[PDB]
Swiss-Prot record:
Its main location: cytoplasm. SUPFAM superfamilies: Cytochrome P450. It is found in: Cytoplasm. Belongs to the cytochrome P450 family. Pathway: Terpene metabolism; (R)-camphor degradation. It holds the Pfam family p450. It comes from Pseudomonas putida. It catalyses: 2 reduced [2Fe-2S]-[putidaredoxin] + (1R,4R)-camphor + O2 + 2 H(+) = (1R,4R,5R)-5-hydroxycamphor + 2 oxidized [2Fe-2S]-[putidaredoxin] + H2O. One of its GO terms (cellular component) is cytoplasm. This is Camphor 5-monooxygenase. Heme binds at residue 348. GO terms for molecular function: camphor 5-monooxygenase activity; heme binding; iron ion binding. Involved in a camphor oxidation system.
């Protein structure tokens, strides 16, 4: 359904893009969003979909807006407006200066030091999961690896029972790619309903898990509040359950379809880290935004206070103006430009954990299952939202071509 056009929005800037169900989704979700970068499309457009909002379509504008938190606030970062208004995770729903103090605490539980710590367990799980699948000659990658690998690592880090995954994964997904059964607010409240007693228990009897660390932590030298801890833990859960999980599938779908790229990483494993970065660019998958804090003229367009603007992190790296032949994948690409992990004061705090999980996955999978393909006659379908993903990824391979070790 289309929302009536606001008085200040000119008809020539209207492009009814639906971030939750883009028109050309069948061509691939990144390709679907890339339609916003076709010749006849302005740098900044207005869509009447999902309540009505602006969309910056080029990396230059996306980066500029993420840098200017004075005009583009993170207070209401999600579309539709109801979701943006209910969204109160920390530090994401805050603008500097108040936002900053919380980043250090979050870094304590998902930062580099923690990643180096988890390395062995991460490697161990990747190898265990892949070796169990190897002899089968087939798998449903989304449920057999993409989900269990990153999620079990996060549940371990957070000290939560793996039996809780189905419930938590359902809630997380309603906040990024809602099925319609729950509003963002209802999903958020359910997630908080889950966390509240756990946070209280771990503030009473602290453990060494991420929730205990956050719940008993300090920010700028003072005690974090129970509510603040809840709002931060909610964000961590979403990050651990709906980011890398989706990215791994986009990456594996690509590798399954491109033997040449597979062979390259097999023959020259030292290129895996670079490959990871190029894949993060080509299969970028996040798209949230900001809300205008005041009337503001941006790139010749009059924006009004209260207007929401989607700033697709996904689009920056796909912009031909940032990377030549953007849809092409080259592991030797010189200057890989992208904003896959965000831009500005809210740069992703879990990017180190993410990269480690991606690299370990590429290395351990290609080592054991070097040759695999999309299952016969399968047509991979993608899904779009705040974080886009892959609905299903059936893969097949000849066990005789695999290596057990
Ligand atoms: C492929 C994986 C990932 C991608 C593409 C990604 C992307 C992003 C992006 C684009 C933002 C900025 C949002 C904004 O400015 O509104 C962000 C923030 C954040 N991410 Fe990630 N992320 C990933 C994985 C993770 C993981 C595994 C964690 C750990 C749970 C994590 C924790 C966070 C946190 C705590 C923030 C908030 C930073 C702040 O608001 O100051 N992320 N991420
Ligand atoms: C946009 C994000 C990818 C980032 C980490 C999880 C996420 C869904 C948020 O709400 C902030
Ligand atoms: K809000």
């Amino acid at each position: 359904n289309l929302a009536p056009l606001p008085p200040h929005v000119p008809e020539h800037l209207v492009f009814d893009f639906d971030m939750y169900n883009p028109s050309n989704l069948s061509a691939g979700v990144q390709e679907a969003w890339a339609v916003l970068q076709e010749s006849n499309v302005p740098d900044l457009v207005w869509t009447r979909c999902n309540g009505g909002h602006w969309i910056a379509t080029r990396g230059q504008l996306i980066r500029e807006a993420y840098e200017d938190y004075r005009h583009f606030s993170s207070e209401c970062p999600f579309i539709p407006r109801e979701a943006g208004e209910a969204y109160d995770f920390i530090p994401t729903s805050m603008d500097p200066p108040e936002q900053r103090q919380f980043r250090a605490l979050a870094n304590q539980v998902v930062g580099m030091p923690v990643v180096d710590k988890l390395e062995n367990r991460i490697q161990e799980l990747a190898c265990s999961l892949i070796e169990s699948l190897r002899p089968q000659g087939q798998c449903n990658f989304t449920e057999d690896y993409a989900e269990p690998f990153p999620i079990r690592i996060f549940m371990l880090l957070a000290g939560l029972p793996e039996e809780d995954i189905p419930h938590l994964k359902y809630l997380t997904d309603q906040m990024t790619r809602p099925d319609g059964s729950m509003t963002f607010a209802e999903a958020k409240e359910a997630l908080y309903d889950y966390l509240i007693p756990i946070i209280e228990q771990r503030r009473q009897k602290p453990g060494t898990d991420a929730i205990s660390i956050v719940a008993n932590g300090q920010v700028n030298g003072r005690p974090i509040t129970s509510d603040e801890a809840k709002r931060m833990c909610g964000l961590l859960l979403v990050g651990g359950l709906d980011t890398v999980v989706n990215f791994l599938s986009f990456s594996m779908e690509f590798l399954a379809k491109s033997p040449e790229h597979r062979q390259e990483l097999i023959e020259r494993p030292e290129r895996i880290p670079a490959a990871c970065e190029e894949l993060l660019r080509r299969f970028s998958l996040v798209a949230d935004g900001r809300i205008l804090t005041s009337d503001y003229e941006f790139h010749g367009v009059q924006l009004k206070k209260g207007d929401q603007i989607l700033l697709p992190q996904m689009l920056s790296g796909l912009d031909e103006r940032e990377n030549a032949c953007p849809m092409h994948v080259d592991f030797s690409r010189q200057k890989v430009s992208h904003t896959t992990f965000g831009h500005g004061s809210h740069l992703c705090l879990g990017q180190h954990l993410a990269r480690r999980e991606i690299i370990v996955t590429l290395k351990e999978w290609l080592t054991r299952i070097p040759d695999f393909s999309i299952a016969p006659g399968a047509q991979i379908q993608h899904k779009s939202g705040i974080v886009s993903g892959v609905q299903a990824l059936p893969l097949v391979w000849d066990p005789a071509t695999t290596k057990a070790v």
